[PDB]
């Protein structure tokens, strides 16, 4: 994978199918892609597969299990502090790989499959070069932040917005993903 | 259904590309001229015709989706050809860029009108003409999105 970074989205389930599957915990659907649009009866957000693990934000997945074709799957990692949870990446998904170039120029992939430039202004923050209303970003928690070669730099967590417009975003650097695995 | 950002177009004389940016289907004036674009309801005329910039634009056709302009100022461009081939191009200036790996002109033929993307897939410019030395294209000429933005 590399550049230019292009992304597309595909809906696979609807409101009722999601609820039944949520309860049954058995999803026999075909899974493809590196980023999965995820949902609970509460909210919808994203989960990103990095190195065989499907990572998402704790404030969305809480400590719930992921519905798989073999019943619910318990989390592999939970880290309330890092705001991370991770389940084994579903069979069929493709994983991203952590960044290894230290690029300061990141690209956040929204739930609508829009790639938006973000200039890193710290270990867990970056600013939108072209701000957007906070609604553009709703549902995007857990989504990936990539460097020019399409490697994971971090997972979108919260947006630093003011007056209703997101000007910057706070993310979970891929390093926390490592510290969360070792412990 | 699936919508395309880049349309492959033709005139009796030639074939080239058009790119949809900001709701307008842009292409090179040296390809379209002042011709209208075909539609199921009859020919639709150019919204913009900037003969100077070698630029023309009609209202975006059907089965198309618009591309977003670049706002990251990257110099790492990527040219999409008429065969959907992607060619890495390093920007040399306002409207010029060097192919990272030169290709024989045939490979770039018929792609004018196509887009020059930044590492985020956003429109940096519109492919105007290939700058080749002895049949080998090693650079490209392009219309910056800002120009399209200005013409609107």
């Amino acid at each position: 994978m590399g550049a230019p970074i292009t992304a597309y989205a595909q809906q696979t389930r609807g409101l009722l199918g999601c609820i039944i599957t949520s309860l049954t915990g058995r999803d026999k659907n075909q899974v493809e892609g590196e980023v999965q649009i995820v949902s609970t009866a509460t909210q919808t957000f994203l989960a990103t597969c990095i190195n065989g693990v499907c990572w998402t934000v704790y404030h969305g997945a809480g400590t719930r299990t992921i519905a798989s074709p073999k019943g619910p799957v318990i989390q592999m990692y939970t880290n309330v502090d890092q705001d991370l949870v991770g389940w084994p990446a579903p069979q069929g998904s493709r994983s991203l790989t952590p960044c290894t170039c230290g690029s300061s120029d990141l690209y956040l992939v929204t739930r609508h499959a829009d790639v938006i430039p973000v200039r890193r202004r710290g270990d867990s923050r970056g600013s939108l070069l072209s701000p957007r209303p906070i609604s553009y970003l709703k549902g995007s928690s857990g989504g990936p932040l990539l460097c020019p070669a399409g490697h994971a730099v971090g997972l979108f967590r919260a947006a630093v917005c003011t007056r209703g417009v997101a000007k910057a975003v706070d993310f979970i650097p891929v390093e926390n993903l490592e510290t969360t695995m070792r412990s | 259904q699936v919508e395309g950002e880049v349309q492959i177009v033709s005139t009796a004389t030639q074939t080239f590309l058009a790119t949809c940016i900001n709701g307008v289907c842009w292409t090179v004036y040296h390809g379209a001229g002042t011709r209208t674009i075909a539609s199921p309801k009859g020919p639709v005329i150019q919204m913009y015709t900037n003969v100077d910039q070698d630029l023309v634009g009609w209202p975006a056709p059907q089965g198309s989706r618009s591309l977003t302009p670049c706002t990251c100022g990257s110099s790492d461009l990527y040219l999409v050809t008429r065969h959907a081939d992607v060619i890495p191009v390093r920007r040399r200036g306002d409207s010029r860029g060097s192919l990272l790996s030169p290709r024989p002109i045939s490979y770039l033929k018929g792609s004018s009108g196509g887009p020059l993307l930044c590492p985020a897939g956003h429109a940096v410019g519109l492919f105007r003409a290939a700058v080749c030395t002895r049949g080998v294209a090693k650079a490209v000429d392009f219309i910056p999105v800002e120009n399209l933005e200005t013409t609107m």
């Binding site: 992304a7 | 259904q1 699936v2 919508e3 349309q7 492959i8 009796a12 590309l17 058009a18 020919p43």
Partner: peptide, 16 residues
């Protein structure tokens, strides 16, 4: 004359 669309390119490679 008229410019006619003979095809389309989807940048993300999204399948039908």
């Amino acid at each position: 004359g008229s410019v006619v669309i003979v095809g389309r390119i989807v940048l993300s490679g999204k399948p039908a």
